[PDB]
Design a protein around this ligand. Structure first.
Ligand SMILES: CCCCCCCCCCCCCCCCCC(=O)OC[C@H](COP(=O)([O-])OCC(O)COP(=O)([O-])OC[C@@H](COC(=O)CCCCCCCCCCCCCCCCC)OC(=O)CCCCCCCCCCCCCCCCC)OC(=O)CCCCCCCCCCCCCCCCC
Ligand SMILES: CCCCCCCCCCCCCCCCCC(=O)OC[C@H](COP(=O)([O-])OCC(O)COP(=O)([O-])OC[C@@H](COC(=O)CCCCCCCCCCCCCCCCC)OC(=O)CCCCCCCCCCCCCCCCC)OC(=O)CCCCCCCCCCCCCCCCC
Ligand SMILES: CCCCCCCCCCCCCCCCCC(=O)OC[C@H](COP(=O)([O-])OCC(O)COP(=O)([O-])OC[C@@H](COC(=O)CCCCCCCCCCCCCCCCC)OC(=O)CCCCCCCCCCCCCCCCC)OC(=O)CCCCCCCCCCCCCCCCC
Ligand SMILES: CCCCCCCCCCCCCCCCCC(=O)OC[C@H](COP(=O)([O-])OCC(O)COP(=O)([O-])OC[C@@H](COC(=O)CCCCCCCCCCCCCCCCC)OC(=O)CCCCCCCCCCCCCCCCC)OC(=O)CCCCCCCCCCCCCCCCC
Ligand SMILES: CCCCCCCCCCCCCCCCCC(=O)OC[C@H](COP(=O)([O-])OCC(O)COP(=O)([O-])OC[C@@H](COC(=O)CCCCCCCCCCCCCCCCC)OC(=O)CCCCCCCCCCCCCCCCC)OC(=O)CCCCCCCCCCCCCCCCC
Ligand SMILES: CCCCCCCCCCCCCCCCCC(=O)OC[C@H](COP(=O)([O-])OCC[N+](C)(C)C)OC(=O)CCCCCCCCCCCCCCCCC
Ligand SMILES: CCCCCCCC/C=C/CCCCCCCC(=O)OC[C@H](COP(=O)(O)OCCN)OC(=O)CCCCCCC/C=C/CCCCCCCC
Ligand SMILES: CCCCCCCCCCCCO[C@@H]1O[C@H](CO)[C@@H](O[C@H]2O[C@H](CO)[C@@H](O)[C@H](O)[C@H]2O)[C@H](O)[C@H]1O
Lengths: 62, 139, 135, 53, 383, 57, 103, 80
């Protein structure tokens, strides 16, 4: 119902409560998984599967 | 003062609820959050207003203890279970249920394999049951 | 006569596991039994910290289950179909090759309907193997 | 330690009386209060006059 | 009352003697009922004999009407005595329970035997004839009183809550009657003060509009079997018949002042059949006479004048109020010196709790003044 | 476990208030029925006058 | 004081709730359950292949075939069925031997 | 103030202006946590749950956990 509870005023206060500490850790995970995906899936050495045209989900579900 | 809870309020502002008259009003004009008398009741304004009572150390003239005759009623019946006993029973039951649900959650979301896997490395593919046995005349 | 229909017929003593039960109730009551924790039909509490804690936990365990149990099936199917159509054929590859294939599958998942269509449509004149390679 | 309230609430809920407001009974009982000394004197005078009549 | 092995042995030992006694009582009660039915059919009013139809104003469902479908035979004393009427009422109760049990047996063949074992282990639903000694009869009566205690409060609360949530009394006297009708048995209720509630409820709900759930509660409180309940007009018929017999007996006693000459045990039984005197209260003759006279006064002069009793619903509530014991309270007052939330002490106070204590604690006025002054200064600076 | 307890909890305050008002009403009715009875007794002057008549004065 | 929810044990309260509080709802629920298990409790092999598998039917091992094979082997072994009987084959045993020698 | 959809509750004043002006403020009695109290930042002086554990440290911890989750297989791949 969103009635009350501890509300940090800014980022620096998220360490003033264990629940908000876990929340900021989770937010860090959420936002930091994106740069990791950028680096991993846009890497120079990444190569498409040579057999990618052998089979695809499009033919399977069709 | 302790950190214990008080009479529950359900997040309702007693100055505007449909049963406001049942809650006594103090000198400051703030209705109590409980049937008791509260001197330091306050109202907080989030998206919705809610009444709050802060416990504090206050001395009240304590009337001397009466005799057991004038307040004890020995009308207990075999089916009767007190609120305290009910609370104890429910606490124990919910403790056991919570442990069981924790085990179930762990097994389901971290150990149980999904059935009918494409590679066949995990989960069962299903099988027939209730097959006839020792009934040659059936065929 | 065999079993009592009343809850008052206790099966254990009042002090059985009193300590652990009290600790459990202490954990339950500290954040929930408050004036500002006014639930909406018992489902949506008023405490902000409850949301802040539970939403990440629910997402984490659901995502772990999905990644390690649900999407794994699709990944394994793609690996099997694209590299021989049998599990032993896939196992004939090295761990690095399997990593490459699984990451390509993740690439396809991220692309979905907005990515380039050359990832599954073979352009004319392409020298890569076709669908009848293993047939 | 307030048995009457407990029993009444439990019985009302157990007979499909989910509602927690009783406007009519409150209206009947809302203005009830202990009388002042002067009011007591007036009531006693009324009772004495009635008995004399 | 919960089942027990001792009661099971008692009932098993007295099973066949109990059945034989029940058969003899059946013959006697059939004779008595034949006499009563012949008298009713011969001298009864046209509406009562023809079973005039009374339909509810909302869904037009037929139910017995207190005025038309109930008749008090003022001249029944010539043919049938008071003791015969009491015997008939007791046999009606026993026959109802035995009929339910026999129906279950016929329906389920030989599969009711374990349920019969459950039945014989409890005195709640066994016939009175199964008791061959005073102690057994006392235990049986205790079981019946326990069932009445279990059932009555629900009926009373249903009635009171429905009326108070859907209507209010018209005048002050009706308000007092309604408030005093549902007092606990520890206090004595004046029938004269409480009578107007009968008219008030007649205005709200008559016996012809009684709801099925309320009927089930009333039947539970009257030791009448309820499973299978079926349509509300079956147990309703049972209740009507029982209270018609009770009213006939009451008129006979009032006219002939039999209760004064009635002995102690017979008077206690007479009060018990009226749901006025529980056996566990160990009432003396003075208290029994007081309660019986209160019941007669509640019936009112109009009962003798014309045989018209007050509203049956309110009458049942009034009589069953004697089983509404005060809510139990056990434990010394010193127990109130303990603490309920000691297990939370180790947790302490978090930042939000500390803030709340600081703002709403003894220093609340100072904090409020400081905050308001700061906000006013900031607002002035902004402008 | 959840619903009926919550509704009983919601009920408690109104019932408590109504029962307090009912008790105060009972006390008020008890007080209102108290009246000081003043009885009138035969004036002794008539008795003295009768005594004089017996004296034949 | 007595109340069903507070004094009775869970099975008893359940029976009371669904017999004297919501009996029609329970009756309709049982009716619907019976209908569902009488008319919506079968799945053909083709249906399972089309939709019965999370990622698709693994034709490279045909688990349905193995399942049916195990079923039939168990039935034959337990019930002592002579699968060489003429009714199963449509021909006499001697004709079967002649065919075996031919092929 | 607000943090996303979470709004900080505010206590309603109870004292009138006349009564309020007569109140004498003595911050010496106030707890060290709440001195120079500001409604717009009541937890500025609130102690940290773990000494030396900043919010940014926890955010970086979560980022590192995400990086591990995404990159562990790249260094220790396993066969099907
Ligand atoms: C073998 C086949 C079996 C078939 C399957 C059966 C399945 C079981 C169903 C139940 C069957 C009956 C069980 C026995 C009951 C006892 C007899 C009886 O009626 O007692 C009176 C009594 C009447 O109750 P009431 O409320 O006082 O009656 C109000 C009337 O106004 C009362 O009128 P009144 O106020 O004017 O007073 C009259 C009173 C005045 O009398 C008295 O006061 C004297 C006492 C008389 C009654 C004595 C009863 C004694 C009961 C105990 C017996 C001993 C048990 C021993 C057990 C242990 C054994 C070891 O006398 C009466 O009570 C007479 C009632 C009318 C007769 C009813 C009987 C009709 C059926 C029999 C004839 C069948 C003919 C078949 C022809 C076939 C042609 C092809 O019976 C009851 O308590 C009612 C039954 C309670 C259980 C109901 C269960 C549901 C039934 C649904 C049936 C639906 C139709 C069938 C299909 C079912 C499919 C699901
Ligand atoms: C030789 C004798 C003389 C001759 C015979 C005479 C005639 C005798 C027959 C007539 C007797 C009538 C009077 C009976 C009175 C007693 C009734 C009674 O039971 O009282 C409760 C009675 C205790 O009574 P009490 O202690 O005296 O308390 C009485 C109070 O006044 C409490 O009172 P209350 O009012 O609170 O209690 C009432 C309660 C009564 O209920 C209960 O209290 C529940 C009793 C069961 C509780 C079970 C709890 C334990 C569960 C255990 C589960 C298994 C655990 C694991 C086992 C592992 C084993 C290896 O609720 C009800 O009344 C609900 C009624 C529900 C009716 C349902 C109707 C359904 C109709 C369907 C819809 C149709 C719609 C129309 C469709 C039309 C379509 C065309 O309960 C028990 O004794 C419990 C027994 C539990 C036995 C063990 C568990 C079950 C074992 C099953 C074995 C299966 C073997 C075969 C398996 C095969 C597999 C393939
Ligand atoms: C956490 C999980 C725990 C476990 C959960 C387990 C799973 C449960 C899931 C489902 C639960 C809900 C189900 C609801 C279904 C729908 C119910 C509904 O619509 O009811 C409407 C409606 C509601 O009833 P009501 O009259 O308004 O009042 C119900 C209250 O409970 C009345 O309350 P009251 O307070 O007013 O009365 C209290 C007291 C008042 O005292 C009395 O009334 C005096 C004593 C009366 C005794 C009984 C008299 C019966 C007279 C004849 C009735 C008609 C018979 C028709 C022909 C026979 C048809 C079979 O009555 C009693 O104490 C009744 C005792 C009954 C004990 C039996 C209860 C069942 C326990 C299990 C035994 C059977 C197990 C079979 C399966 C296993 C086999 C291996 O039902 C009726 O009208 C009753 C019709 C009854 C017809 C007979 C039964 C038909 C069903 C099939 C029976 C099969 C027997 C098999 C024998 C063994 C073969 C091997
Ligand atoms: C294991 C056993 C399985 C058994 C299965 C069978 C069913 C269950 C059996 C019985 C279960 C026990 C409980 C039953 C309910 C009890 C109700 C109750 O408490 O009533 C009290 C009540 C006593 O109270 P009362 O104060 O004396 O009188 C009531 C007041 O009048 C009341 O005053 P009121 O103001 O309320 O007045 C209104 C009252 C007035 O009514 C009455 O009360 C009078 C009595 C009922 C009269 C019913 C007949 C009406 C005329 C029918 C004309 C049909 C012509 C067709 C011509 C076709 C030509 C081709 O009610 C009505 O107006 C209702 C009228 C009926 C409407 C029927 C609508 C049906 C719609 C069908 C839709 C489509 C269906 C599917 C498609 C089919 C076609 C393809 O009882 C009665 O009056 C009679 C009760 C009869 C009980 C049922 C007997 C069952 C016999 C079963 C034999 C067959 C067994 C087969 C077994 C198979 C193997 C297992
Ligand atoms: C010893 C037990 C009693 C033995 C028999 C006693 C004497 C007879 C009794 C009465 C017989 C009634 C006959 C039918 C009457 C009219 C209705 C009808 O058309 O019925 C169709 C059909 C009967 O077939 P039929 O027409 O008589 O003749 C064969 C036809 O040719 C077939 O043609 P079809 O095309 O209709 O065939 C399709 C299919 C159609 O079959 C179905 O659709 C099955 C429907 C089942 C309905 C169940 C009703 C009760 C529901 C309670 C609430 C459950 C909530 C959900 C729970 C989910 C999680 C467990 O038929 C069948 O294969 C019938 C098999 C029936 C098996 C019944 C097994 C019940 C298991 C209940 C488990 C409950 C677990 C609770 C665990 C809780 C733990 C805390 O199904 C039924 O009658 C279903 C109801 C059966 C009730 C039996 C009596 C009560 C239950 C006793 C056993 C309890 C076992 C508990 C195990 C616990 C394990 C942990
Ligand atoms: C890809 C294809 C998609 C197709 C989708 C189609 C829609 C599917 C929707 C399913 C979900 C929603 C279901 C809602 C409920 C539907 C109910 C329904 O229609 O079911 C009917 C069905 C019809 O039953 P039936 O199919 O067994 O009918 C038998 C009829 N003969 C024998 C002629 C074939 O009912 C049941 O399934 C339950 C039957 C048992 C319970 C009732 C017993 C009592 C019957 C009383 C009358 C007869 C006996 C005499 C009287 C009593 C004597 C004791
Ligand atoms: C009814 C049985 C008749 C035949 C005699 C069988 C005796 C078998 C030996 C039993 C020895 C152990 C007994 C322990 C005490 C059991 C107490 C009991 O039954 O209580 C039920 C109690 C629940 O009670 P409440 O509903 O809470 O309230 C009860 C008060 N009304 O149930 C339990 O907790 C389960 C207890 C199970 C104990 C073992 C019972 C074994 C019964 C077997 C019967 C079959 C015949 C055995 C023959 C054995 C020959 C060597
Ligand atoms: C399976 C069925 C089981 C049934 C169980 C119940 C049976 C009950 C039988 C009761 C028989 C009563 O007997 C019957 O009583 C009535 C009423 O006095 C008599 O009735 C007689 O007097 C009345 C009243 O003056 C007249 O309205 C009536 O015309 C006349 O015949 C019958 O002549 C008599 O035969």
């Amino acid at each position: 119902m969103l009635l009350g509870g501890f509300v940090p005023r800014r980022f620096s206060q998220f360490n003033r409560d264990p629940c908000w500490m876990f929340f900021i850790f989770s937010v860090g995970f959420w936002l930091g998984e994106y740069p990791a995906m950028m680096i991993k899936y846009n890497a120079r050495d990444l190569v498409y599967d040579p057999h990618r045209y052998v089979w695809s989900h499009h033919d399977d579900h069709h | 003062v302790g950190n214990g809870p008080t009479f529950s309020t359900g997040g309702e502002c007693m100055n505007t609820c449909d049963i406001q008259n049942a809650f006594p009003m103090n000198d400051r004009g703030v209705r109590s959050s409980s049937p008791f008398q509260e001197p330091n009741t306050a109202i907080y304004d989030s998206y919705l207003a809610w009444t709050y009572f802060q416990p504090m150390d206050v001395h009240i003239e304590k009337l001397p203890a009466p005799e057991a005759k004038y307040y004890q009623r020995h009308t207990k019946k075999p089916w009767d279970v007190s609120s305290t006993e009910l609370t104890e029973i429910q606490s124990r039951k919910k403790y056991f249920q919570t442990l069981g649900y924790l085990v179930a959650f762990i097994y389901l979301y971290f150990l149980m394999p999904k059935e009918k896997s494409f590679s066949g490395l995990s989960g069962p593919d299903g099988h027939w049951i209730m097959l006839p046995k020792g009934r040659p005349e059936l065929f | 006569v065999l079993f009592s229909t009343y809850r008052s017929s206790r099966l254990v003593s009042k002090e059985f596991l009193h300590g652990p039960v009290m600790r459990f109730r202490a954990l339950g009551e500290y954040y929930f039994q408050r004036a500002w924790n006014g639930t909406l039909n018992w489902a949506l509490p008023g405490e902000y910290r409850l949301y802040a804690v539970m939403i990440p936990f629910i997402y984490f365990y659901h995502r772990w289950h999905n990644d390690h149990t649900l999407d794994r099936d699709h990944v394994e199917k793609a690996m099997i179909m694209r590299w021989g159509g049998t599990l032993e054929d896939v196992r004939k590859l090295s761990a690095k090759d399997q990593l490459r294939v699984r990451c390509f599958t993740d690439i396809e998942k991220l692309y979905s309907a907005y990515g380039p269509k050359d990832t599954y449509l073979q352009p004319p004149g392409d020298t890569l193997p076709g669908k009848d390679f293993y047939r | 330690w307030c048995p009457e309230v407990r029993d009444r609430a439990e019985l009302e809920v157990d007979i499909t009386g989910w509602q927690w407001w009783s406007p009519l009974e409150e209206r009947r009982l809302l203005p009830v209060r202990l009388r002042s000394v002067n009011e007591v004197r007036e009531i006693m005078s009324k009772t004495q006059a009635k008995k004399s009549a | 009352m919960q089942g027990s092995w001792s009661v099971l042995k008692k009932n098993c030992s007295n099973f066949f003697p109990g059945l034989l006694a029940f058969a003899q009582q059946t013959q006697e009660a059939y004779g008595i009922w034949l006499r009563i039915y012949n008298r009713q059919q011969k001298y009864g009013p046209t509406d009562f004999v023809e079973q005039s139809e009374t339909f509810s104003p909302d869904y037009h469902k037929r139910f017995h009407s207190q005025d038309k479908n109930m008749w008090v035979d003022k001249e029944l004393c010539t043919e049938v005595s008071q003791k015969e009427v009491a015997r008939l009422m007791t046999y009606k109760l026993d026959m109802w329970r035995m009929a339910h049990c026999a129906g279950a047996l016929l329906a389920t063949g030989g599969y009711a035997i374990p349920f019969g074992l459950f039945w014989l282990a409890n005195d709640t639903w066994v016939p009175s004839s199964f008791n061959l000694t005073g102690e057994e009869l006392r235990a049986w009566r205790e079981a019946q009183d326990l069932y009445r205690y279990r059932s009555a409060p629900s009926y009373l609360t249903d009635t009171k809550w429905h009326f108070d949530f859907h209507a209010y009394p018209w005048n002050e006297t009706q308000e007092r009657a309604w408030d005093d009708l549902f007092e606990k048995n520890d206090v004595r209720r004046d029938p004269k003060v409480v009578r107007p509630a009968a008219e008030m409820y007649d205005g709200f709900i008559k016996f012809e509009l009684i709801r099925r759930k309320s009927l089930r509660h009333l039947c539970r409180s009257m030791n009448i079997p309820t499973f299978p309940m079926l349509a509300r007009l079956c147990n309703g018929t049972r209740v009507r018949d029982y209270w018609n017999l009770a009213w006939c007996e009451d008129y006979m006693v009032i006219t002939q002042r039999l209760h004064e000459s009635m002995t102690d045990e017979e008077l206690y039984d007479y009060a018990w059949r009226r749901y006025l005197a529980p056996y566990d209260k160990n009432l003396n003759r003075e208290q029994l006479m007081e309660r019986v006279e209160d019941y007669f006064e509640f019936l009112g002069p109009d009962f003798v004048a014309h045989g018209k009793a007050p509203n049956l619903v309110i009458l049942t509530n009034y009589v069953l109020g004697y089983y509404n014991d005060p809510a139990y309270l056990e434990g010394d007052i010193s127990e109130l010196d303990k603490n309920d939330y000691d297990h939370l002490a180790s947790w302490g106070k978090d930042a939000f709790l500390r803030r709340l204590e600081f703002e709403n604690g003894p220093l609340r006025d100072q904090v409020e003044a400081h905050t308001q002054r700061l906000l006013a200064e900031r607002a002035a600076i902004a402008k | 476990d959840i619903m009926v307890p919550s509704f009983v909890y919601n009920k408690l305050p109104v019932i408590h208030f109504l029962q307090e008002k009912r008790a105060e009403q009972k006390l008020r009715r008890v007080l209102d029925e108290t009246y000081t009875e003043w009885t009138e007794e035969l004036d002794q002057a008539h008795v003295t006058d009768a005594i004089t008549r017996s004296l034949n004065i | 004081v007595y109340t069903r929810w507070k004094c009775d044990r869970l099975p008893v309260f359940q029976l009371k709730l669904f017999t004297q509080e919501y009996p029609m709802h329970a009756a309709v629920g049982i009716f619907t359950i019976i209908f569902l298990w009488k008319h919506m409790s079968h799945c053909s092999e083709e249906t399972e292949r089309k939709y019965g598998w999370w990622a698709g039917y693994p034709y490279w091992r045909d688990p349905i075939a193995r399942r049916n094979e195990t079923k039939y082997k168990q039935m034959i072994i337990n019930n002592d069925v002579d699968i060489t009987h003429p009714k199963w084959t449509g021909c006499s045993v001697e004709q079967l031997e002649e065919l075996s020698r031919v092929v | 103030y607000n943090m996303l959809v979470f709004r900080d509750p505010k206590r309603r004043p109870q004292l009138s202006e006349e009564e309020r002006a007569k109140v004498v403020v003595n911050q010496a009695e106030w707890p060290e946590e709440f001195k120079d109290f500001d409604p717009d930042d009541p937890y500025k002086n609130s102690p940290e749950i773990i000494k030396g554990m900043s919010s940014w440290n926890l955010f970086l911890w979560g980022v590192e956990c995400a990086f591990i989750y995404q990159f562990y297989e790249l260094v220790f791949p396993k066969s099907i």
